[PDB]
Design a protein around this ligand. Structure first.
Ligand SMILES: Cc1cc2c3c(c1C)C(C)(C)C[C@H]1C(C(=O)O)=C(c4ccccc4)[C@]4(C(=O)NC(=O)N=C4N2C[C@H](O)[C@H](O)[C@H](O)COP(=O)(O)O)N31
Ligand SMILES: Cc1cc2c3c(c1C)C(C)(C)C[C@H]1C(C(=O)O)=C(c4ccccc4)[C@]4(C(=O)NC(=O)N=C4N2C[C@H](O)[C@H](O)[C@H](O)COP(=O)(O)O)N31
Ligand SMILES: [K+]
Ligand SMILES: [K+]
Ligand SMILES: [K+]
Ligand SMILES: [K+]
Ligand SMILES: [Mn+2]
Ligand SMILES: [Mn+2]
Lengths: 500, 500
């Protein structure tokens, strides 16, 4: 089965790419697995596969860390993400995001139901498993639980059956047969939960599938629109209908090749302690436990020699940066274009801890609008900050066509030199805020509201007559023939490979 | 003569350090020299010495580019600056800035007058030189003149004789015997010029010395206090009285080993076209000529085989970042401490195009102050933004003791995650602004006023009870014994030198 359609095949792909380290000696899921994975993420090393995990019993489970993190080389930096999508390993960020957006004006390709698959190779009923007896990792030393769920996909369906959502949201073990997790507005798992709560009749039928098709976990991490079933979006993107099998104990459908499947319910009434957790912005606040959603597990099914993917998240660079930031930026780019705003590209700079998005403006089109900074900032921020795609993003930086938004150094340069603090910015206090950012939920103001800004790093003449500067750099401040002579004589003179 | 006390010896030091490329084939001062130097600066290569400069006649002149720019290796990144100061080449930024501040509570060591020196080996009177006939560089293709002066020191004295200032300010050739240059408030060359203008009797006696003692060019680039003669500050810092010789045509005194000396006057009445220039923030605005100060040259003296230092400034990283930013930050650190503010360290991040300064706070001392963010932001910004040391800096970022301000990645992390836009910031519109930043002089508001901000990236409990988080990083989210085990087994498991 293709790497993008089967997690087991994805793992082989990373091996083939010389992008895997298999660790066959015993590794402790109590911090050691996640510490190794953390180090990998902070140094862009090869992904670790822990084949001998202390506590693994009857096939549950191995761990793969850092599934969507960065490679060291510039040429295949985003190769792990490309392997989620059938793209060449040298694919650019632009090409990855364009692939993730491609299904947005295609007909869905609904999934195909098949009678069985590898995820049914083993099963444990409610008398045979105990989640406290599995080798669930402690990922950070101050975490408030063992986070089984950092890279699986929650599956919930609207009461009326018309929308089945796939998404990543964290969850930790509560007891032998329950998890607790984050279920917060405006996320789709929350939106659907609300529907069931209003109906008031039953808990939400639920499944959590780990080690799903890589193209599916990518969509699970992207804010595609309300009401859109991720399975059909992934089908359209990949050009193939995804093969799903029915759960044993409910009527939801899971990828046939899922490594591990939990079946059960998400309560409409119960809560339990959740967190704290070492989160995407690089912090944990020890002891900050709050009540979270409570999930009951009724059944586990799993592949022979099951592998659990794990994100050891926190400071740069991991899945919470490469996927959350980048996929939100992609959706924001489309959202802006659909609102008739002249945006060509968007990216969440890693330097900003993916709290900013830089928006590249087609300034020819801007000039024809005959507008001003105040007006344009206001229009852009209203579109983005009033939409779910803008939830995680607290600063938008508008830049002209000379800036490559996928290059943080160039975004930082433009922001620092072209946006006058205060005057060239518009603050938004009456929009939903992202509480996980420390300055929100642990800050001086309302955890859930405001703290957003549009920072205009377009220069004045970009709105009127055109760019009126040249950079003081090698590229722009010397003629072509001179630059080429310098390059051609560089090593000859005594000064100092793409792939590496 | 020691490298820090003699430019010629500094050049030998760079050779010895394997940090020089000598180019003995003909190089054009029309863009080629500066393009090579630009490339060096953008790639942290070895400094170029152009020994065969097309147009050099009767000893005037060779060029050294990139004298204060960065080396490629992390271990001796700031080695060129260390060589300005007699420090080991592995000196940290903290050690360099501490050396530059050390003279601030020492008695000056006045200079020693000597009867002659290498700068008197050759001379040209007013009938023998023509500045348009020297190999003065065109540094950027759209510059409004040939910038002879990018790394020499202007020497002017107060009318009453009590203060002799040494500083770097750009100047370009106007005609056979004049320069034009930037002389702007609140700079000391401007302050002294004003004194002479008010007196109204004569033009300002002036000298411009190129290839001065490296310790002297460092102080020339630092905003040491009003009224303080740089020569005596450098004397105290180095522990040695600088040897100076009298000019031939005026009573000013120049370093004995100066490579090239211009003697003449800075007019109190005349101006001429100056600029545009490819400036520190990385831009040129072609055609933006304005009137600048006008200097008359009466005499040139110079060393045999004179070397002119040159800064090919613009985008990262050159002298305008490593020296302007860092030395301003040093002075701001002291200024804050002298105003009883609990600041331990300051640096201007290169990522900010040296328009920000990050201020590391001793949060134990902050807590004892029993204050709040609003109040503290206001106090810090009033101290810094009302002082000349804060002129070039438009954003101050307050960070707690866990942040290494000399590490831009960590400053960016703290700023992005700990400072809520708007609420955690105070804007300053009634302070002097830095017009060279594009968003000031080519922006939407007053070129000379406002556009400054204090951004508080201290978390709330840093003011009260103490830091209440741990980072989600390898360092902080795993116990010591586990971290060391991971490190010790890293290569054994299959994962991947200080000097490199
Ligand atoms: C990749 C990823 C992702 C994620 C995550 C992760 C990962 C790895 C972890 C590791 C697990 C971490 C965690 C966190 C932390 O950091 O902790 C987080 C946060 C983040 C943001 C926000 C809020 C939260 C999560 C949770 O928990 N919750 C939620 O909610 N979400 C989320 N995410 C996101 C998501 O996925 C999107 O958003 C879509 O989009 C969904 O879908 P829809 O359908 O709804 O649209 N998570
Ligand atoms: C290192 C260096 C330095 C500098 C410079 C340079 C260099 C290399 C060049 C290349 C030549 C460039 C240029 C510019 C541009 O960018 O163009 C500039 C600007 C900058 C800022 C500001 C304003 C301007 C200069 C001019 O021009 N002017 C002035 O004014 N200044 C200046 N600087 C600074 C200085 O030096 C300080 O500030 C002290 O401090 C002084 O002293 P006192 O005594 O007064 O204190 N410059
Ligand atoms: K999703
Ligand atoms: K602007
Ligand atoms: K100075
Ligand atoms: K703050
Ligand atoms: Mn969804
Ligand atoms: Mn001075």
């Amino acid at each position: 089965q293709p790497a993008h359609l089967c997690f087991r095949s994805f793992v082989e792909a990373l091996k083939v790419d010389n992008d895997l380290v298999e660790i066959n000696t015993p590794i402790d899921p109590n911090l050691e697995a996640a510490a190794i994975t953390r180090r990998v993420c902070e140094t862009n090393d090869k992904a670790p596969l822990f084949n001998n995990l202390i506590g693994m019993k009857n096939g549950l489970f191995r761990i793969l860390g850092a599934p969507g993190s960065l490679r060291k080389s510039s040429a295949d930096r985003y190769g792990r993400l490309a392997r989620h999508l059938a793209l060449p390993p040298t694919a650019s960020m632009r090409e990855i995001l364009d692939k993730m957006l491609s299904a947005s004006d295609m007909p869905p390709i609904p999934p195909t139901i098949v009678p069985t698959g590898p995820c049914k190779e083993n099963s444990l009923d409610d008398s045979e498993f105990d989640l406290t007896e599995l080798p669930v990792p402690l990922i950070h030393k101050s975490d408030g639980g063992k986070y089984i769920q950092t890279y699986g996909m929650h599956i919930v369906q609207s009461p009326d059956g018309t929308w089945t959502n796939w998404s990543i949201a964290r969850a930790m073990v509560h007891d032998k047969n329950h998890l607790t997790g984050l279920v917060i507005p405006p996320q789709h798992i929350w939106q659907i939960h609300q529907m069931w709560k209003k109906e008031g009749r039953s808990d939400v039928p639920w499944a959590l599938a780990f080690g799903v098709p890589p193209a599916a976990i990518m969509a699970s991490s992207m804010p595609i629109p309300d009401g859109v079933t991720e399975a059909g979006y992934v089908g359209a993107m990949t050009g193939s209908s995804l093969e799903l099998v029915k759960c044993d104990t409910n009527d939801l459908y899971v990828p046939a090749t899922s490594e591990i499947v939990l079946e059960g319910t998400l309560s409409i009434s119960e809560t339990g302690p959740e967190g704290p957790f070492g989160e995407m912005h690089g912090y944990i606040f020890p002891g900050d436990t709050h009540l979270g959603a409570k999930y009951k597990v009724n059944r586990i099914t799993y592949r022979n020699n099951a592998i659990m993917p794990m994100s050891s998240c926190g400071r740069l660079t991991d899945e919470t940066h490469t996927m959350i930031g980048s996929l939100a930026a992609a959706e924001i780019r489309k959202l802006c274009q659909q609102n008739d705003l002249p945006i060509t590209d968007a990216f969440a700079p890693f330097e900003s801890q993916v709290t900013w998005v830089a928006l590249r403006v087609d300034t020819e089109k801007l000039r024809a609008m005959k507008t001003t900074s105040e007006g344009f900032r206001k229009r852009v921020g209203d579109v983005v900050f009033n939409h779910k795609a803008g939830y995680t993003i607290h600063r938008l930086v508008l830049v002209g066509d000379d800036i490559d938004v996928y290059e943080g150094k160039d975004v930082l340069w433009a922001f620092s030199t072209r946006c006058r603090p205060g005057m060239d910015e518009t603050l938004f206090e009456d929009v939903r805020g992202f509480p996980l950012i420390p300055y929100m939920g642990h800050g001086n103001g309302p955890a859930h509201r405001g703290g957003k800004v549009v920072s205009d790093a377009l220069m004045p003449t970009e709105y009127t007559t055109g760019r009126n500067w040249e950079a003081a750099d090698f590229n722009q401040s010397y003629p072509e023939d001179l630059k080429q002579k310098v390059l051609d004589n560089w090593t000859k003179m005594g000064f100092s490979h793409h792939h590496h």
